[PDB]
Write a protein that binds this ligand. Structure first.
Ligand SMILES: OC[C@H]1O[C@H](O[C@H]2[C@H](O)[C@@H](O)[C@H](OCCCCCCC3CCCCC3)O[C@@H]2CO)[C@H](O)[C@@H](O)[C@@H]1O
Ligand SMILES: *C(=O)c1cc2ccccn2c1N[C@@H](C(=O)O)[C@](C)(COC(=O)Cc1ccc(O)c(O)c1)S(=O)O
Length: 265
């Protein structure tokens, strides 16, 4: 595989789309690779990690409990609710909803949690409170995945997302237990995680949240590193490409391969 930046360029050429990427040291925030890092990209499902960070902040403040059971109705469900559609009779705890949203990409679980933090406006205010003045959520699932060209709604930038993930996982803004919980939810991805692990060389740590949208939108926020350690945050977003989902997955994997083969930088 070629050098990271060269592979990223090759992906834009082959996809006819825009790629946004940041590779950052998790412990210190040192930026290693940055491509279109300040350009906007739809967050898609990756917003769910920030959402659960806002939920954990409420738990830390005593305004929420992960144990609290929420009962909802069938009319509250939106498209793709693999876990939440199974609990119309018994409900789900707040903690279970975050696990469903992050590890199973459950859209209704995400909307139920979004309401608890004040909706899109409330989550955006949370972002502003932790110092992210760029990322914004404006809609609910599943409209937030629309990815209209030039639409600033429901977007982030690679640099803003990486910094925000770092703040939530390591800056001590969240309690130790909350930081550990957010990390574990990413480690527990039941969809993309297992497949990625199957193709990663032995010894590489992976935790992640992936997302997809219209007009070729595709992305992943991940923790990756050799020696079975979460050494770096890697954020990759793709937008405005007419390519098949398989090809978008392949290009993202190719950028990861370039990072793995040229890790010491
Ligand atoms: O020299 C380094 C390695 O080169 C190959 O490994 C390949 C691997 O066989 C392939 O399956 C993977 O694809 C990349 C799989 C990455 C999938 C997701 C990437 C995501 C998640 C993490 C952040 C970026 C995006 O690339 C590596 C590097 O070439 C060899 O197979 C392996 O024995 C060797 O240790
Ligand atoms: C957010 O999670 C998301 C947003 C959208 C929008 C439209 C359709 C599907 N979306 C998802 N979820 C989806 C992705 O994030 O892509 C899930 C998590 C599935 O994914 C994968 O398909 C992961 C994957 C990648 C490559 C493969 O070869 C493979 O078998 C799986 S969800 O639909 O389960």
């Amino acid at each position: 595989s070629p050098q990271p930046l060269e592979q990223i360029k090759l992906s834009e050429s082959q996809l006819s789309g825009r790629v946004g990427m940041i590779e950052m040291d998790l412990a210190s925030g040192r930026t290693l690779t940055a491509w279109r890092a300040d350009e906007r990209f739809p967050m898609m499902s990756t917003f769910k990690v920030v959402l659960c960070g806002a939920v954990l902040a409420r738990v830390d403040a005593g305004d929420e409990q992960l144990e609290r059971k929420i009962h909802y109705r069938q009319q509250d469900l939106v498209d793709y609710s693999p876990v939440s559609e199974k609990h119309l009779a018994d409900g789900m705890t707040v903690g279970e909803l975050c696990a469903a949203a992050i590890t199973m990409s459950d859209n209704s679980a995400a909307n139920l949690l979004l309401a608890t933090v004040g909706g899109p406006a409330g989550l955006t205010a949370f972002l502003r409170q932790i110092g992210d003045n760029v990322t914004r959520l404006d809609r609910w699932e599943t409209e937030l995945n629309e990815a209209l060209p030039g639409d600033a709604r429901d977007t982030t930038t690679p640099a803003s997302m990486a910094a925000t993930l770092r703040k939530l996982l390591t800056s001590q803004r969240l309690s130790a237990r909350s930081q550990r919980q957010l990390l574990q939810w990413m480690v527990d991805d039941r969809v993309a995680g297992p497949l990625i692990r199957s193709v990663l060389p032995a010894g590489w740590f992976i935790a992640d949240k992936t997302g997809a949208g219209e007009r070729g939108a595709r992305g992943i926020v991940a923790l990756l590193g050799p020696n079975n350690k979460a050494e770096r945050i890697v954020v990759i977003y793709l937008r405005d490409t007419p390519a098949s989902m398989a090809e978008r997955n392949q290009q993202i994997a190719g950028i990861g391969a370039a990072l793995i083969e040229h890790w010491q930088r």
